[PDB]
Write a protein that holds these residues in place. Structure first.
Motif, mmCIF file in Angstrom:
data_model
loop_
_atom_site.group_PDB
_atom_site.id
_atom_site.type_symbol
_atom_site.label_atom_id
_atom_site.label_comp_id
_atom_site.label_asym_id
_atom_site.label_seq_id
_atom_site.Cartn_x
_atom_site.Cartn_y
_atom_site.Cartn_z
ATOM 1 N N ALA A 59 0.838 -1.247 -0.062
ATOM 2 C CA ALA A 59 0.092 -0.100 0.018
ATOM 3 C C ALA A 59 0.885 1.189 -0.090
ATOM 4 O O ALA A 59 2.094 1.495 0.741
ATOM 5 C CB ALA A 59 -1.017 0.177 1.219
ATOM 6 N N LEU A 91 1.866 -5.479 2.803
ATOM 7 C CA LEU A 91 0.737 -6.543 3.454
ATOM 8 C C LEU A 91 1.233 -7.561 3.988
ATOM 9 O O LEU A 91 1.851 -8.244 3.257
ATOM 10 C CB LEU A 91 -0.215 -6.611 2.287
ATOM 11 C CG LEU A 91 -1.133 -5.296 2.031
ATOM 12 C CD1 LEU A 91 -0.558 -4.309 1.362
ATOM 13 C CD2 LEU A 91 -2.510 -5.640 1.268
ATOM 14 N N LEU A 100 -3.758 -5.230 5.595
ATOM 15 C CA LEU A 100 -3.183 -4.236 5.715
ATOM 16 C C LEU A 100 -3.669 -3.766 7.040
ATOM 17 O O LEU A 100 -4.883 -3.640 7.404
ATOM 18 C CB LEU A 100 -3.590 -2.939 4.618
ATOM 19 C CG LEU A 100 -3.036 -1.750 4.939
ATOM 20 C CD1 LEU A 100 -1.436 -1.542 4.537
ATOM 21 C CD2 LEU A 100 -3.452 -0.985 3.759
ATOM 22 N N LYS A 107 -7.699 -3.690 6.791
ATOM 23 C CA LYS A 107 -8.303 -3.764 5.490
ATOM 24 C C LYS A 107 -7.925 -5.173 4.937
ATOM 25 O O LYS A 107 -6.677 -5.509 4.721
ATOM 26 C CB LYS A 107 -7.822 -2.783 4.515
ATOM 27 C CG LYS A 107 -8.336 -1.361 4.987
ATOM 28 C CD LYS A 107 -7.504 -0.383 4.055
ATOM 29 C CE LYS A 107 -8.126 1.177 4.129
ATOM 30 N NZ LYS A 107 -7.242 2.161 3.550
ATOM 31 N N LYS B 61 -4.165 6.792 -1.527
ATOM 32 C CA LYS B 61 -3.920 5.463 -1.282
ATOM 33 C C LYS B 61 -3.910 4.533 -2.471
ATOM 34 O O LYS B 61 -5.118 4.481 -3.038
ATOM 35 C CB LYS B 61 -4.777 5.003 -0.284
ATOM 36 C CG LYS B 61 -4.422 5.693 1.169
ATOM 37 C CD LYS B 61 -5.488 5.225 2.421
ATOM 38 C CE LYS B 61 -5.745 6.272 3.082
ATOM 39 N NZ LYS B 61 -6.584 5.732 4.297
ATOM 40 N N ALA B 62 -2.758 4.054 -2.662
ATOM 41 C CA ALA B 62 -2.823 3.330 -4.129
ATOM 42 C C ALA B 62 -2.302 2.013 -3.651
ATOM 43 O O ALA B 62 -1.386 1.832 -2.714
ATOM 44 C CB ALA B 62 -1.664 3.819 -5.041
ATOM 45 N N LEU B 63 -2.501 0.817 -4.147
ATOM 46 C CA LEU B 63 -1.972 -0.589 -4.187
ATOM 47 C C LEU B 63 -1.221 -0.955 -5.336
ATOM 48 O O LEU B 63 -1.808 -0.882 -6.284
ATOM 49 C CB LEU B 63 -3.245 -1.499 -3.712
ATOM 50 C CG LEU B 63 -4.018 -0.949 -2.424
ATOM 51 C CD1 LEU B 63 -5.269 -1.709 -2.600
ATOM 52 C CD2 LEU B 63 -3.359 -1.493 -1.165
ATOM 53 N N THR B 64 -0.067 -1.669 -5.106
ATOM 54 C CA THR B 64 0.616 -2.358 -6.066
ATOM 55 C C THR B 64 0.681 -3.651 -5.821
ATOM 56 O O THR B 64 0.929 -4.135 -4.819
ATOM 57 C CB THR B 64 2.093 -1.674 -6.335
ATOM 58 O OG1 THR B 64 2.513 -2.314 -7.295
ATOM 59 C CG2 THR B 64 2.659 -1.662 -5.058
ATOM 60 N N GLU B 86 -7.242 3.493 -4.347
ATOM 61 C CA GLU B 86 -8.283 2.948 -3.375
ATOM 62 C C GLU B 86 -8.796 4.012 -2.438
ATOM 63 O O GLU B 86 -10.216 3.783 -2.354
ATOM 64 C CB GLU B 86 -7.580 2.101 -2.187
ATOM 65 C CG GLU B 86 -8.564 1.318 -1.162
ATOM 66 C CD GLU B 86 -7.796 0.858 -0.363
ATOM 67 O OE1 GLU B 86 -6.797 1.352 0.231
ATOM 68 O OE2 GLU B 86 -8.102 -0.569 -0.060
#
Lengths: 149, 149
Positions: A59, A91, A100, A107, B61-64, B86
């Motif tokens: 994240a 994560l 997370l 989450k 908030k970004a997720l990779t 997100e």
């Protein structure tokens, strides 16, 4: 979001609740338990990833100086040019779930393909095994309740 | 990070503290105040932006799904390809400061050029005016203490 209240089995909280109410009526100050091995409150959000999408491993908190957000999707994939990376969080993995954690707020991300025939109860129960084990506590020594908030 | 405890002027908390300790010694449960107009606890992080950098207007908030983060800077500018957005949060403005709020946790961003000769006290005092005004409370009716944590 879900609000989850957990309790160590066998512990009675009736005199705690009575004394909290007494303190509120005298001081005007409402007291709530600090999360502990005996009792606590946590918040959980569950996201299901669509088919053909990978689960996240990190994240990223990024900041942009752009003065509008009309080019940014909420809940979709995109590319972000010229952003400031402020925080990265790895994560945790528990089975197919990615988790997370920020203090008492969690989450979880699960692949569509893994939870196709699963209900909220099954997911929450898996999460709670993860949660207790993460704290070093025995899950069989707790009960918990769930509330939509 | 800074931990800030605020208190409504004139209110005495000695009997609250004595009753919290009594409840802890009897139940083993530590109770803390819910943030209210009378009393509370907040957390503040202050970031100064370098010269030639714009203040943020949005936090993303970004997720990779990438399995390592060795290409991502912490606290620098970069481009993020193929990330899942997100959450987006618009920062509030208070003078030259930008403020990101999540419940009782605050992050403020100020330009180097604006706070060149400012100390922690001056910043915190400005933030606390913003904070009280955001709640609809009169700042002159409160005291607060700051702790590095």
């Amino acid at each position: 979001i879900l609000e989850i209240l957990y309790y160590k089995k066998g512990k009675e909280f009736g005199i705690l609740e009575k004394k909290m109410k007494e303190i509120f009526n005298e001081t005007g100050v409402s007291l709530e338990p600090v999360n502990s091995e005996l009792i606590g409150r946590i918040f959980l959000k569950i996201s299901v990833l669509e088919e053909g999408e990978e689960v996240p491993s990190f994240a990223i908190k990024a900041l942009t100086p752009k003065e509008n957000a009309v080019d940014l999707p909420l809940g979709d994939w995109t590319d972000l040019k010229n952003v400031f990376v402020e925080e990265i969080d790895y994560l945790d993995s528990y089975g197919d779930m990615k988790i997370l954690s920020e203090k008492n707020w969690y989450k979880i991300y699960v692949p569509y393909s893994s939870v196709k025939k699963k209900n909220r109860n099954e997911l929450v129960e898996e999460f709670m095994k993860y949660f207790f084990e993460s704290k070093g506590w025995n899950p069989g020594e707790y009960t918990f309740s769930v509330q939509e908030i």
